[PDB]
Amino acid sequence: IRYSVPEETEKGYIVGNISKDLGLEPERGVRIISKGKTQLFSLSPRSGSLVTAGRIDREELCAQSATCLLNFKVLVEDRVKLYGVEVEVVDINDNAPKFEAENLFVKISEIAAPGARYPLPEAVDPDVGINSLQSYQLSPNRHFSLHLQTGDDGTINPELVLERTLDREEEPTHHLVLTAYDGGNPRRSSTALIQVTVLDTNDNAPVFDQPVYRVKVLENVAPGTLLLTVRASDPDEGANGKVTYKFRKINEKHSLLFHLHENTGEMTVAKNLDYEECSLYEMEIQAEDGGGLKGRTKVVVMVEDVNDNRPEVTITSLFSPVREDAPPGTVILLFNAHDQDSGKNGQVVCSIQENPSFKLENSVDDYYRLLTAQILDREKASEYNITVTATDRGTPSMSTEVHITLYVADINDNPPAFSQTSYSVYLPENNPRGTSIFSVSAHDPDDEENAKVTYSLVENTIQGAPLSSYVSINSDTGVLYALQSFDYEQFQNLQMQVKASDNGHPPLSSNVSLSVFLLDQND
Ligand SMILES: *[C@@H]1O[C@H](CO)[C@@H](O[C@@H]2O[C@H](CO)[C@@H](O[C@@H]3O[C@H](CO)[C@@H](O)[C@H](O)[C@@H]3O)[C@H](O)[C@H]2NC(C)=O)[C@H](O)[C@H]1NC(C)=O
Ligand SMILES: *[C@@H]1O[C@H](CO)[C@@H](O)[C@H](O)[C@H]1NC(C)=O
Ligand SMILES: *[C@H]1O[C@H](CO)[C@@H](O)[C@H](O)[C@@H]1O
Ligand SMILES: *[C@H]1O[C@H](CO)[C@@H](O)[C@H](O)[C@@H]1O
Ligand SMILES: *[C@H]1O[C@H](CO)[C@@H](O)[C@H](O)[C@@H]1O
Ligand SMILES: [Ca+2]
Ligand SMILES: [Ca+2]
Ligand SMILES: [Ca+2]
Ligand SMILES: [Ca+2]
Ligand SMILES: [Ca+2]
Ligand SMILES: [Ca+2]
Ligand SMILES: [Ca+2]
Ligand SMILES: [Ca+2]
Ligand SMILES: [Ca+2]
Ligand SMILES: [Ca+2]
Ligand SMILES: [Ca+2]
Ligand SMILES: [Ca+2]
Ligand SMILES: [Ca+2]
Ligand SMILES: [Ca+2]
Ligand SMILES: [Ca+2]
């Protein structure tokens, strides 16, 4: 005979009455013939019906078998043969479906196109039939949907559908909930936390912060200094987010002038710069990632001038000797100045040290003309030390120095002068014919020919004009010559005038009286 029983029922539950099926009143000495490790059954003498004495969990008995049966024999001592019975447990919904873990994740790439279905974790329910697993439901998401594959086997395969393309740069991971439902009401359920991990595709190219990097630096800039810093943006991950910087202008000398750190992207100075050589350095640099993805930006170096140059004087006209008769205003120097620098560093101030003798005049533009201020006189000063100082107007100031030595020429304006205003010479009567009797000296302040004395004598006729016959002088000896002997009784004294003239045109002359006195002797 067969019967049934609900699972997990308390001890003493109703089972098909045994006595009414055997054919005897509720003495009999009847006992159960089966043998288990433990037994869950015991017949009740109160009603003659078997009542279970232990909790029945067919999940711990038949597991997933659709029909769970417990067939056992029973023994009646009144008779000589046994009676075989069989009781099939039914299934109730007490177990909830279970997943493999509390947290499971699915890897999805960034390049994954919409329409891709990814396997979802499949749950398990110990129950059988309606009480077993029935359906799934997925939390709504803008990027995903749910897809179920029910089968003839009764098992459903769940998988998610990609609705919108994913992007890790906006959000790396998603958080969704997958719920599992059975059919045995009161229905159990099981939620499951799923994380959508987005992989990385190299779809981000490096993009520099600014499209143009600008720096303004002086020319005196020391090599090894840090010009600037260049940064590029790559939101990717790993080598796809790494940056490497290098110039695109690879052949010109600018590559030798600057240094660009391949990693840090620092623009530094390698060689000294010069505003006069070149002040506009336009270059184009480029950054790359792990792949061939690259970005460009322009770096512009602007150099500015610095006072590191001295003024340069070029002389056009020089007149080292000047005539002493020069009026105040005659030029003695003609030159100009020019600085290599620009602006206030290029303006020049040509200043002679203020002296009374000369003055400097800025005739036109920056051409300078050095002139005189008074009349010169080489008998008081024949030499002049001139120091023209050309200082630029920048800061700090740089001054070049031009030295001129000025020797004035000789113009004959000074006549020769004798040693005395008047000379007197004594000689006794006896006079050896043609002998020299005196010595007269003269001097001239001028130089060279304008100081060369040419001695002469006035031509006033003594009786018969023996001025030449009486006396003679040589142009250079400066000595007097008595030609004839003298008697105190013919003449006593003779007055002449000696002349001195400088031998150069125009000549300057000077006469001075000179008297010869004879002396008386024993005639
Ligand atoms: C303007 O300044 C210059 C120098 O800055 C003065 O020149 C003088 O020149 C002589 C040489 O010409 C200097 O030395 C001497 O040299 C001769 C040979 O030439 C030598 O024999 C001597 O033993 C001596 O070393 C001299 O030192 C130099 N300075 C002075 C003060 O005489 C020139 O005199 C200056 N002009 C005026 C108007 O002061
Ligand atoms: C001689 O000297 C006097 C005074 O120095 C001068 O006045 C006179 O003109 C001179 N004689 C001649 C011929 O120049
Ligand atoms: C899963 O869902 C069932 C039915 O919605 C609930 O009864 C259960 O408590 C869990 O929330
Ligand atoms: C769904 O809800 C259960 C509670 O029944 C959680 O344990 C689970 O992690 C998910 O959040
Ligand atoms: C000729 O010699 C006489 C001798 O007294 C000098 O006085 C004169 O100057 C000249 O040289
Ligand atoms: Ca159970
Ligand atoms: Ca069950
Ligand atoms: Ca269930
Ligand atoms: Ca992206
Ligand atoms: Ca990416
Ligand atoms: Ca990248
Ligand atoms: Ca320079
Ligand atoms: Ca300069
Ligand atoms: Ca300068
Ligand atoms: Ca003079
Ligand atoms: Ca000179
Ligand atoms: Ca003179
Ligand atoms: Ca003279
Ligand atoms: Ca005499
Ligand atoms: Ca005599």
TrEMBL record:
- Entry keywords, A to Z: Calcium, Cell adhesion, Cell membrane, Glycoprotein, Membrane, Metal-binding, Repeat, Signal, Transmembrane, Transmembrane helix
Gene Ontology cellular component?
membrane; plasma membrane
Subcellular compartments: Cell membrane
Known glycosylation sites = 189, 191, 436, 511
Kindly list the GO molecular function terms attached to this UniProt entry: calcium ion binding; cell adhesion molecule binding
Query: Which parts of the sequence bind Ca(2+) 10?
Result: 324, 377, 379, 413
Residues recorded as binding Ca(2+) 9, renumbered to this chain, are 307, 309, 339, 341, 345, 392
| UniProt superkingdom | Eukaryota
| Record-listed Ca(2+) 13 binding positions | 429, 487, 489, 520, 523
Topology versus the membrane, per the UniProt entry?
Single-pass type I membrane protein
Q: Where on this chain does Ca(2+) 11 bind?
A: 324, 379, 410, 413, 446
Q: Where does Ca(2+) 6 bind?
A: 202, 204, 234, 236, 240, 289
Annotated residues for binding of Ca(2+) 5:
110, 169, 200-201, 203, 236
What positions does the entry give for Ca(2+) 3 binding?
A: 93, 95, 125, 127, 131, 182
Residues that, per the record, bind Ca(2+) 4: 110, 167, 169, 203
Question: Record-annotated residues binding Ca(2+) 7?
Answer: 219, 274, 276, 308
Q: Name one GO biological process term.
A: homophilic cell adhesion via plasma membrane adhesion molecules
Give every Cadherin domain span: 1-99, 100-208, 209-313, 314-418, 419-523
Disulphides: 62-68
Q: Which residues bind Ca(2+) 2?
A: 7, 59, 91-92, 94, 127
Q: Which residues bind Ca(2+) 12?
A: 412, 414, 444, 446, 450, 502
Residues binding Ca(2+) 1: 7-8, 57, 59, 94
Described purpose of this protein according to its UniProt entry: Potential calcium-dependent cell-adhesion protein. May be involved in the establishment and maintenance of specific neuronal connections in the brain.
Its protein name is: Protocadherin gamma A9
Q: Which organism is it from?
A: Mus musculus
Q: Which gene encodes it?
A: Pcdhga9
Which stretch of the full-length chain is present here?
32 to 558 of 932
